[PDB]
Copies of this chain bind each other. A is one copy, B any other.
Amino acid sequence: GHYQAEAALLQCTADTLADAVLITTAHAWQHQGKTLFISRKTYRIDGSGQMAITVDVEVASDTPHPARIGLNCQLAQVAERVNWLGLGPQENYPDRLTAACFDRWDLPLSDMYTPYVFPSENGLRCGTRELNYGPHQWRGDFQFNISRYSQQQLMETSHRHLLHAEEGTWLNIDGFHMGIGGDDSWSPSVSAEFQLSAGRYHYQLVWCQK
């Protein structure tokens, strides 16, 4: 029930600090009674206008290792260039990133999508310390993709030509992403060291307008 998991709020509090506002939340993703994931978050918005996000995730040892552990959202803005300090320029994944180089990259948005004839998650870039899109800067140590297509449309659509740009820009920022494999295409092939099996995961982001 990974694709159907319903978020159930456990905690949601606010605090006033000397020079910032702290938002603490906790969620449990469940499927018919079973708790798959718990997400514990803090948001820290300070004087300079930076929103520091800490995320600590629990994964039930007996659920199949998840495809990713990140955050997503549909952004309103539609910019033309995607600029980042990280691995690139082309799409790279944890078990397919040796060719990619760490530098400052700048591509058109359409270059951050890969037109696989049968549509799937695509266009990830890894080991990114900084991402710039329109007015938005994200800093940390993460993996991301960015496109006019949602994970939902991508998985619902059998051919690339049947896809339609969605309003705004879909952003996927992953603390962690499972390998893609390919030793064959008829049995699981993602190696143990690229499966998301640690049980407890932590990543942090800073979101400010630059």
Q: CB within 8 Å of B: which residues of A? A: 13-18, 22, 56, 141, 200, 202, 204
Contact = CB atoms under 8 A, between A and B. Distances in A.
Majority secondary structure of chain A interface residues (helix, strand, loop or mixed): strand
A14 B18 CA distance: 8
Nearest to A22: B17
Q: Enumerate the 10 nearest inter-chain pairs by beta-carbon distance, A residue then B residue, closest first.
A: A202-B202, A15-B17, A15-B18, A141-B200, A13-B18, A17-B22, A56-B204, A17-B17, A15-B15, A22-B22
A98 to B, nearest CB: 16
A16 B16 CA distance: 8
A120 B13 CA distance: 46
A56 B140 CA distance: 13
A87 to B, nearest CB: 15
Given A15-B22, A16-B17, A56-B202, 6 more contacts: A13-B18, A15-B18, A17-B17, A17-B22, A56-B204, A141-B200
Contacts of A22: 15, 17, 22
